Amino acid sequence: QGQLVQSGATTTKPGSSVKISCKTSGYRFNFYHINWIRQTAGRGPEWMGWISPYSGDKNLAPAFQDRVNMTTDTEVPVTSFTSTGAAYMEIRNLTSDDTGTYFCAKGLLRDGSSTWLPYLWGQGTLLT
Amino acid sequence: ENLWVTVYYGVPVWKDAETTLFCASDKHNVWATHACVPTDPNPQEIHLENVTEEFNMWKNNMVEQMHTDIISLWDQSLKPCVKLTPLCVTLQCTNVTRGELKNCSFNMTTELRDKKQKVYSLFYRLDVVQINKEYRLINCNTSAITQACPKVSFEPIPIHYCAPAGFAILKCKDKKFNGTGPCPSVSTVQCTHGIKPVVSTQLLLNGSLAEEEVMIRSENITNNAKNILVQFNTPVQINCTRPNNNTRKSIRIGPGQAFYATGDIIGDIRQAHCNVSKATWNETLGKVVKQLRKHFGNNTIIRFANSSGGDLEVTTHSFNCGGEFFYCNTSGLFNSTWISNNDSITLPCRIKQIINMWQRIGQAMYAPPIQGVIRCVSNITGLILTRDGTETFRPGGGDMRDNWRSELYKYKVVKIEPLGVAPTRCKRRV
Amino acid sequence: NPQEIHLENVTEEFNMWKNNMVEQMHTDIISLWDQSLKPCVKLTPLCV
Amino acid sequence: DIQMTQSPSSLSASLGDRVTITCQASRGIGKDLNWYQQKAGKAPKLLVSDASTLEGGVPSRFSGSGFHQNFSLTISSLQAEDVATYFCQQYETFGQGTKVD
Amino acid sequence: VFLGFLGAAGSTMGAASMTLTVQARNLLSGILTVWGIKQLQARVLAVERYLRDQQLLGIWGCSGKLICCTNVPWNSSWSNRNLSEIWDNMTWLQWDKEISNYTQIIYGLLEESQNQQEKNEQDLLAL
Amino acid sequence: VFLGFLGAAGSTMGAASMTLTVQARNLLSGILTVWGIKQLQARVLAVERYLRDQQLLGIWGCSGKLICCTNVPWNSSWSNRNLSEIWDNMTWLQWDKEISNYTQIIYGLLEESQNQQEKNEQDLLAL
Amino acid sequence: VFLGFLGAAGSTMGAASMTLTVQARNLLSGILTVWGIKQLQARVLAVERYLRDQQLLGIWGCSGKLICCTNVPWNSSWSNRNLSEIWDNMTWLQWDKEISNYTQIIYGLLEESQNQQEKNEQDLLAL
Ligand SMILES: *[C@@H]1O[C@H](CO)[C@@H](O[C@@H]2O[C@H](CO)[C@@H](O[C@@H]3O[C@H](CO[C@H]4O[C@H](CO)[C@@H](O)[C@H](O[C@H]5O[C@H](CO)[C@@H](O)[C@H](O)[C@@H]5O)[C@@H]4O)[C@@H](O)[C@H](O[C@H]4O[C@H](CO)[C@@H](O)[C@H](O)[C@@H]4O)[C@@H]3O)[C@H](O)[C@H]2NC(C)=O)[C@H](O)[C@H]1NC(C)=O
Ligand SMILES: *[C@@H]1O[C@H](CO)[C@@H](O[C@@H]2O[C@H](CO)[C@@H](O[C@@H]3O[C@H](CO[C@H]4O[C@H](CO)[C@@H](O)[C@H](O)[C@@H]4O)[C@@H](O)[C@H](O[C@H]4O[C@H](CO)[C@@H](O)[C@H](O)[C@@H]4O)[C@@H]3O)[C@H](O)[C@H]2NC(C)=O)[C@H](O)[C@H]1NC(C)=O
Ligand SMILES: *[C@@H]1O[C@H](CO)[C@@H](O[C@@H]2O[C@H](CO)[C@@H](O[C@@H]3O[C@H](CO[C@H]4O[C@H](CO)[C@@H](O)[C@H](O)[C@@H]4O)[C@@H](O)[C@H](O)[C@@H]3O)[C@H](O)[C@H]2NC(C)=O)[C@H](O)[C@H]1NC(C)=O
Ligand SMILES: *[C@@H]1O[C@H](CO)[C@@H](O[C@@H]2O[C@H](CO)[C@@H](O)[C@H](O)[C@H]2NC(C)=O)[C@H](O)[C@H]1NC(C)=O
Ligand SMILES: *[C@@H]1O[C@H](CO)[C@@H](O[C@@H]2O[C@H](CO)[C@@H](O)[C@H](O)[C@H]2NC(C)=O)[C@H](O)[C@H]1NC(C)=O
Ligand SMILES: *[C@@H]1O[C@H](CO)[C@@H](O[C@@H]2O[C@H](CO)[C@@H](O)[C@H](O)[C@H]2NC(C)=O)[C@H](O)[C@H]1NC(C)=O
Ligand SMILES: *[C@@H]1O[C@H](CO)[C@@H](O[C@@H]2O[C@H](CO)[C@@H](O)[C@H](O)[C@H]2NC(C)=O)[C@H](O)[C@H]1NC(C)=O
Ligand SMILES: *[C@@H]1O[C@H](CO)[C@@H](O[C@@H]2O[C@H](CO)[C@@H](O)[C@H](O)[C@H]2NC(C)=O)[C@H](O)[C@H]1NC(C)=O
Ligand SMILES: *[C@@H]1O[C@H](CO)[C@@H](O)[C@H](O)[C@H]1NC(C)=O
Ligand SMILES: *[C@@H]1O[C@H](CO)[C@@H](O)[C@H](O)[C@H]1NC(C)=O
Ligand SMILES: *[C@@H]1O[C@H](CO)[C@@H](O)[C@H](O)[C@H]1NC(C)=O
Ligand SMILES: *[C@@H]1O[C@H](CO)[C@@H](O)[C@H](O)[C@H]1NC(C)=O
Ligand SMILES: *[C@@H]1O[C@H](CO)[C@@H](O)[C@H](O)[C@H]1NC(C)=O
Ligand SMILES: *[C@@H]1O[C@H](CO)[C@@H](O)[C@H](O)[C@H]1NC(C)=O
Ligand SMILES: *[C@@H]1O[C@H](CO)[C@@H](O)[C@H](O)[C@H]1NC(C)=O
Ligand SMILES: *[C@@H]1O[C@H](CO)[C@@H](O)[C@H](O)[C@H]1NC(C)=O
Ligand SMILES: *[C@@H]1O[C@H](CO)[C@@H](O)[C@H](O)[C@H]1NC(C)=O
Ligand SMILES: *[C@@H]1O[C@H](CO)[C@@H](O)[C@H](O)[C@H]1NC(C)=O
Ligand SMILES: *[C@@H]1O[C@H](CO)[C@@H](O)[C@H](O)[C@H]1NC(C)=O
Structure with a gap:
């Protein structure tokens, strides 16, 4: 029930790497995963991976395992049930095939069968 | 949908309260540590994962309670002791062979009520005032005076404040925690550490x-x-x-x-x-x-x-x-x-x-x-x-009380309220 | 009506020399003695 | 170290007008601001303490509000007895004052 | 796992609800000198607060229960949250805040629903 | 209607019997200074008298019940009154006076009828 | 026969088990002066020790029971004695000594066996 603001549209060229931010608020950051999903021109949407700010655990698709740098900071507590977090994302071998809009998404629940499901999303970032 | 409320007894929820704490410890010292319950040799400290509590060392009532407890134990440890009001008599004082400590002789009452005695005693400067030179104890014109019993000790003994059953104390594990704010790492204890x-x-x-x-x-x-x-x-x-x-x-x-x-x-x-x-x-x-x-x-x-x-x-x-x-x-x-x-x-x-x-x-x-x-x-x-x-x-x-606040910042008193009502698809029979 | 119940078949170990009732009675009397002298007059003026 | 900018320095209004005075702080002070009223040849009188708490005995026409850095003192329906100098207070630093006429 | 007294304070309402006896044990035992009267006042306070919770369980037909199911249907005015977004999302601490206002109302409904239930059972056995 | 604490004191035994939780709530909460020891003595007295009534309900198999049905058949020596001339004629105040003598006897019958009932249930489940 | 308070102390575990209410009655009533504070300290002590036994019965699903049957199977490590050599041979005094060590273990088993039993009953009524 909070915002997940992201970075700006940083357009580079193939070969380089790009780091996109995702600063959270209005909710306990360490209680939900942070999913990363992209919708490029050439395919539809593709799920990249999520990371658990609490456990530090990371699970990402084999199509992006050897490309994605997925790290998180540690929440700065605001109130008892509110904090402010930050999630980072990078890509290694960047090309023009990877041009699209990228988002971060907060997990759906804290338990059950839909724990990590991308429920609360950011706004998007335009790549190369 | 089909949702009826259900009662749960024993839910991890609490409120900020203030109750009467009691002491625990491990010659009689002024802090009557012998009258306290023995400190348990196995101190249970439960760490509250994921919990984030608000603290405020500057509103803490444990401080205001400790401060009147000490005052209360001080006054308790002076009732049986001798009253030095017969000492409030004119003193004949001379320097000792700069000029800080004096040498003062006075007429004093003996064990018989009709006999006197000319005794002498040494007194520091800060305890007398003038009128051989004629002096007088400092307190005489303001307050009665009571000699501390010479068998009680002023030694700070580690005291532990414990909360009653149904209450708890919440520590603060944050190594860089300043005065107020939300403690990221929190644990619950039954008593405080050994506070001198x-x-x-x-x-x-x-x-x-x-x-x-x-x-x-x-x-x-x-x-x-x-x-x-x-x-x-x-x-x-x-x-x-x-x-x-x-x-x-x-x-x-x-x-x-x-x-x-x-x-x-x-x-x-x-x-x-x-x-x-x-x-x-x-x-x-x-x-x-x-x-x-x-x-x-x-x-x-x-x-x-x-x-x-x-x-x-x-x-x-x-x-x-x-x-x-x-x-x-x-x-x-x-x-x-x-x-x-x-x-x-x-x-x-x-x-x-x-x-x-x-x-x-x-x-x-x-x-x-x-x-x-x-x-x-x-x-x-x-x-x-x-x-x-x-x-x-x-x-x-x-x-x-700032002294007590310097050791009680880590702690907070909360009241456990274990009754919780929450809905599920459950109903009892007929 | 003082109820005294007899414990058939029971056999208990006693030790009058460790009994705490004794140590408790002795301080109770002392405690009641000291209680019964607080309101009474002090004969310190008699020390003449 | 703190700086209180009180505005305006002087104003004039008729009987029954709404008068507002502002005090700006150079940095966040929470709600630690007090408002006073001082007439000619008299000692100040506390109107509002803690930014928005009206002192006892002060007529209800007075009111204050503010937080962080923007504060205000309001006199709903000015009267003749209200002619004085009003200034805010942040600890030991005072505003420069406002002379109402 | 054994988290300890209030160990599941930050866990979800479903997780903590399996660790009820943990908090139920230490509610009555724990996890004329100055200290003498200070301790006696605490020993009486612990009993009074305990019997008050037991008194409410008794007049709700829940005496002896840790998880007790009732007859009062959940009014969505109290909380219009889904079941899966409560027991697997919220902590009992958050829940007690969101139901702060309506708690006194539910406590009355659970009472007459029990005096009418046993009044009905007195008729079911009148034959 | 809500008559209040002891509101149905003058009403018939049947009417008052529907307002039991009313009197059950205020039995434990209510509707070294001089006052300090005077209040502590009252706080302990309230708990002792409460647990005594709860103790009797427990050894009668009625713990948690407001209306509790038993196995002791009503001896007409206690009161040879008809059912309709009691619950729709008398007030609980009058009834407590008429059964003043026989009250201690019933309290014993309700006790062994429970220790034999559970001793029987221990045999019913011995297979 | 009526043996009295602890009358069956020397009798067999089976005989004494029929005289439970005898010992259950006198557990709470009985069979700033010096005596004033000495008596108040005893009146509070009696309640605390009583509610502790009641607290254990409550979290074992035995609240209100004198003879209570459970789900914990008897580990022969605790006592490898035959049924007929216990209830018709031993006295409760001897039995409490032989089970001195294992008593704290059984008390925990009887607790989780109740929180899992009601957690299961909450699912049996989820339909
Ligand atoms: C404190 O707060 C945090 C944050 O809210 C809580 O952390 C969350 O806990 C819940 C439950 O414990 C987690 O939900 C479960 O998620 C697992 C998915 O994990 C699996 O996959 C991972 C990636 O492949 C993998 O890492 C896991 O492997 C284990 O090892 C890692 C090592 O890093 C360890 O950290 C993990 O915890 C794993 O143990 C694992 O293979 C999912 O499988 C669960 O679903 C099953 O169980 C539920 C019932 O619970 C059932 O309904 C399902 O059908 C399925 O059977 C479950 O969804 C959640 O992921 C955690 N993290 C979040 C929310 O960010 C923490 O529990 C709190 N602790 C306390 C004490 O309060
Ligand atoms: C604080 O002030 C008090 C006074 O109020 C001091 O107390 C006095 O201290 C002096 C010493 O400083 C004492 O004087 C000494 O008395 C000794 C006792 O002898 C007496 O008794 C014999 C009988 O056996 C008589 O014959 C004799 O005349 C005395 O009456 C003497 O032995 C001492 O003699 C020494 O001095 C003389 C002359 O200087 C020498 O010739 C001797 O050889 C010897 O060295 C001395 O006279 C006095 O008695 C104390 N008074 C009391 C009441 O006790 C405290 O000392 C002082 N304290 C501090 C810390 O300042
Ligand atoms: C801060 O803490 C310090 C240590 O915790 C305090 O030091 C203590 O001070 C007290 C009194 O000032 C001392 O008690 C005295 O002990 C001596 C003899 O002690 C020696 O002999 C015993 C044998 O029993 C031996 O066990 C000791 O180790 C010593 O070798 C007595 O003669 C006195 O009458 C008095 O009882 C403590 O011993 C001393 N502790 C230490 C470790 O030095 C200090 O006072 C505290 N400061 C403040 C301001 O409170
Ligand atoms: C103890 O010694 C001090 C120091 O010499 C004395 O102080 C003097 O007191 C007189 C008053 O009588 C003053 O006029 C002097 O100026 C003081 N001198 C100093 C250096 O301060 C003191 O009087 C002595 N006390 C006794 C009892 O002899
Ligand atoms: C302080 O003074 C006392 C006496 O006023 C000294 O105590 C004496 O100690 C010796 C042993 O060293 C004994 O033989 C004496 O009998 C003691 N005298 C008394 C009156 O008890 C003490 O030694 C002194 N201590 C210091 C550090 O100066
Ligand atoms: C305070 O006192 C302590 C002990 O009385 C001093 O510690 C001693 O220091 C010397 C020199 O380093 C060592 O040889 C001793 O072994 C130390 N004593 C102990 C018990 O360890 C300390 O130096 C003093 N400090 C000050 C500032 O006075
Ligand atoms: C004063 O200095 C230190 C406090 O930092 C204490 O000495 C250390 O005490 C801790 C725990 O008591 C031990 O683990 C260390 O080994 C001690 N260090 C040394 C060099 O001995 C000392 O007890 C303090 N004294 C007080 C607080 O009275
Ligand atoms: C004095 O301390 C108080 C409390 O620590 C401060 O009040 C907080 O101020 C911040 C920033 O202005 C607000 O975001 C909080 O909401 C305030 N909390 C409360 C409880 O008032 C206050 O700002 C401090 N004042 C000064 C001058 O430093
Ligand atoms: C004690 O009393 C006598 C009585 O005259 C007096 O002369 C003497 O000075 C007094 N002593 C002191 C120390 O005051
Ligand atoms: C403290 O010491 C300084 C010099 O060391 C001195 O000037 C001052 O007077 C002293 N304090 C008092 C209260 O005398
Ligand atoms: C503080 O220092 C000044 C100058 O060094 C001195 O005059 C004064 O007496 C001192 N005060 C105290 C309390 O030591
Ligand atoms: C007590 O005596 C002192 C002498 O040092 C004097 O300054 C003070 O005013 C007196 N106080 C009272 C309360 O009489
Ligand atoms: C303590 O830290 C918090 C957050 O870091 C901050 O808001 C607060 O002002 C700090 N306390 C003080 C007294 O500065
Ligand atoms: C919900 O509560 C309101 C008042 O709080 C009441 O008017 C309404 O009838 C209730 N609805 C249900 C379904 O119980
Ligand atoms: C309870 O009432 C207060 C009234 O001040 C309101 O602010 C609060 O939002 C209410 N609680 C809920 C959960 O709506
Ligand atoms: C009624 O009570 C008397 C003694 O009070 C008893 O002798 C009689 O058997 C009882 N009758 C019934 C039917 O219980
Ligand atoms: C109870 O016994 C007394 C004995 O004095 C008798 O007067 C009274 O009538 C008896 N009660 C009833 C209801 O008969
Ligand atoms: C008996 O207890 C031991 C430990 O005391 C345990 O290891 C064993 O599994 C238990 N056996 C049964 C049948 O419960
Ligand atoms: C309990 O443990 C003690 C350990 O000293 C042992 O002597 C005793 O025999 C044990 N109890 C039983 C019934 O074996």
């Missing part, structure tokens, strides 16, 4: 250190009328001694009533004082001056001065050493100006005997003299500064 009720001034003695860095706490640090509670991370050692070899002399002033008088000094007459390592005190003032810039500026200069006025208790490092109440000049510790970028300090300490302890005007206490040579070793683990309304910080104190 050290009555001190300016320099917090024998207390608990800070892990990691040296902390600094205050309500409004921008408010000059709020004492800064700086807590060290490395203790700087201070050694105090009264080197005179004093002697105690019993004087029967009535049936079963014996006033313990200072007999005479056996050997050299010397000054009482305290030593701190000038090197270790230099590096500790630096650690303090560093965290002082985080709130006032990387370029502004931080200056230390001595007190600017007040009574003896607040203008000096007031404390107690082996049973005698010292009052140390601290001008040699707070005389530095810090820019944007064997050794020993010695403090002249005086000694008093008619002490009013807290701020009560009406209940004075005569501390009986301690035989032998007094020396004690203690750590100064905290500090109580006061910035001038260049930002200059000068020591101070007086309100003894």
